[model samples]
Target: MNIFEMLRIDEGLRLKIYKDTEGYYTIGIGHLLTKSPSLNAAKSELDKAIGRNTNGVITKDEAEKLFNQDVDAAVRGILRNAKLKPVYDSLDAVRRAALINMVFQMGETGVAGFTNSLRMLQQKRWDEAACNLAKSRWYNQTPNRAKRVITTFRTGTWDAYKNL
Candidate 1:
């Protein structure tokens, strides 16, 4: 599966700045502006990325750029984690994408907390891993996407959420 396409669908596109469900300032494709070291720092980085000082609005092209950078960061962070790197290396493409998707939605720290699920994944216990994931707050908060990811892990197939 193309991670970009999946994320664009899951995150949706917003050109203007708005507060996420957590009330943090965000823009574009779930880019958490507040996640930067500081709001001002985030704005500066956004300006550089978009090549202009944005007034809470950006173009589709700029959004795509930001999405790419964010996804790359998530992927890199997932691969860099000592605990996750080995498990990630052992997964097939579909399951790897699902892992990346999980990390994209939640930070590496957030997913790292799923110790049981990680162990299940490491042991290639797909059903157990999916079950552990399904029992989480992350699953409850994003049931649809969570189901798709869990199905990917359980089935090890790219067709799990092809339509979605």
Candidate 2:
């Protein structure tokens, strides 16, 4: 599986279209929300919908699009702060993408703050970098997302939670 495959774009777009028709803007993916729900009940409902929609999918493009939208501005800032070209050049695609996702979610400063992780990665200490991934506030805040990415990094497989 690939990152794109994990996002299930076609199916997600269908689901999103359906939800939009029903005046539900909020959609859930794993533990992440597409938008803030109007109420707790709405949030719960959206979570269930997300779970159903995400089940057995290779990837969700809609989710990826949303993620990119969420991270676009911030990522630009990161690129501007320092040329990510070197890091991008050195890392495997999966590792680079995972790091990009992390930076997008946590901001350039937050991602850069992972000194030990960066150092370990620079040293080609894959396990150490994965371990360091677990030590961050980002990990504590979004454990499931962090775990999925870390699994992707460690296994070099995109499908982390199949048949679950």
Candidate 3:
């Protein structure tokens, strides 16, 4: 509770994806929706779907609480998905981080979709696993990021790609 009531929220939050004169599909904290989250009218549609008013305000404690809860859930998802395979236990911590990041990038199902890649990893086919990674559309779709993952993957030793 500083002086000005002066609490400042993010521009996305301030202008709000909706509530702006543009009236785009928007929701709490400026999260965009209905493009699929948000149509120009979708903003209001979110308003309809969410059944919650976005008019609430925040304070330091509430912000911290929300941040903690949301952050925990995200980390929880990453760890949970990372451990989904028996091979995950075989990886060193850095490799575990790489796997967790992958799980974070692709939801559990999407990662599971990398069947051949997972199989190669299980067989300890580091090069094959790396090659299998590049075979997917995900490789071409985000070329640079995937390459980073690929490079780290190719080496299979976290020391060379610890920054990964």
Candidate 4:
């Protein structure tokens, strides 16, 4: 399939923040606790992700910064694939944003396996991407959420990720 769809399938979305299968205090899509993150570090990230803290509060703007860092992780994930400047640079900002979301959902290491998807994305073949994305079983148990991600995969918009 094409790359965008491939990302959609592999990095499927989960709107609510929660502990992942590995259960280390994940948030937003798949914002996994990482790099030996302490329990406090994990709480701090959630504090940012949801705009409040264990004993304080913050603006959505503040909370939104994690999404920024999340994007950085996405780029980092993409890096595991290659310099592929043409591949990543060729991507739409909106599409890239979507991938960022996918990266979050798939955890920081998710994009490495997206090789076929990235290759297709690099080639700019939207249809094949979507077609293959349609067949992905990643989100099978979460059908509604999967549909939403698939819908966005076709549109490739950041509307889903706005306001943190």
Candidate 5:
């Protein structure tokens, strides 16, 4: 499957606001609606995008649009990150997509904290990389999603859709 399809299933969809695993308000492919600065600007952006007061509800198309934007941001963020760029560049298409998905969920800084994991990935040590990822709080907080990503990193395949 493609990156979009993988992300769609992993992130899931929410037309209405819901609390993320971190208890922050989020919607539309795990887009954070609060916690950046304030919910005010976030809600206003949503309202303007939907051409109405949305009232915390969004359409599928709008969600997809936001997902696209988020993915782009994730890619750009990783590329711009000095610590992550070489590791990101060393990966294959499948592994790169997996890294982008992680960045999408956690941002570059969050993913950058995985020192051992990133080094393992860059060194092409798939087994060690997967194990390192599993050792994180990110894995414990969202086991299924983390496992899927870890498996993808280990196998270097689109197993995220096939398993977990």
Candidate 6:
């Protein structure tokens, strides 16, 4: 499953993963799972996540922009987080990008939110890092995404994150 697919953006459920006002999409809060309002409010809330400028109407371009921006911001945040920096620095470009993508989808705070995961990575424990990832709240939430990222991390391969 592609990251976008795992995000269920094409499910007509309103892919409002960002902060918007009119509401039109859904937002995935990592361990919090998916959230939606009453059917009546779903579009409005999604629009809000997407921003109010579209007048509660979400265009394809807007959706794409929101998706890309949110993912990019999330990845950047992961890289900025002090705890994950060392591990990130040690990774090859591909593996690093893959991990950033994983954190983007899962949330930097969510993935590295726990003490054990952060500690394991800081200690340069690859096996433990993999284990920490598996035990994360994001693991089964998006199985394919989780697997791809975990595999990349475990094998030190960057190929997995190369695809858009």
Alpha-carbon lDDT of model 3: 0.50
* Model 4 residue 8 distance off true place after TM-score fit, in angstroms: 16
Q: What value does the lDDT take at residue 137 in candidate 1?
A: 84
* Candidate 1 lDDT, 6-72, residue by residue in tens: 7787788999877666666788998887654466776776677678889668989888888999999
Clash pairs detected, candidate 1: none
> lDDT by residue for model 2 over 42-63, one digit each (tens)?
4455445445534323236555
Candidate order by TM-score, highest to lowest? 5, 1, 6, 2, 4, 3
Q: Each candidate: what lDDT?
A: 0.83, 0.55, 0.50, 0.54, 0.86, 0.57
- Pairwise TM-score winner, candidates 1 and 5: 5
User: In candidate 4, how many Å is residue 149 off?
Assistant: 3.4
Error of 4 at 59 (Å): 8.1
Poorly placed runs, candidate 6 (over 4 Å): 1-36, 39-42, 48-57, 122-124, 158-164
Top model by lDDT, which number? 5
**TM-score versus the correct structure, for each prediction:** 0.88, 0.55, 0.54, 0.54, 0.90, 0.61
Give the C-alpha miss distance for residue 88 in model 4, angstroms.
2.0
lDDT string, candidate 4, 18-103, tens digits? 45555656543344645343666766765655656542233344434554566666677765655434465677766665555555
Model 5 RMSD in Å is 2.2
Instruction: State each model's C-alpha RMSD to the native.
Output: 2.5, 8.8, 9.4, 7.1, 2.2, 6.2
Q: Write the per-residue lDDT of candidate 6 for residues 99-129, one digit (tens) a residue.
A: 5666655577766666676566556676877
Estimate, for each residue in 1-164, the C-alpha lDDT of model 3 and write its tens digit: 11011011221233334443234343343333444423445545544444544333333444344334433443466456643466566665545545654553455667767878877776778888988899887777655656656655566554433332
Question: Candidate 4 — what's its lDDT?
Answer: 0.54
Winner on lDDT (4 vs 5): 5
When 4 and 5 are scored with TM-score, the better candidate is 5
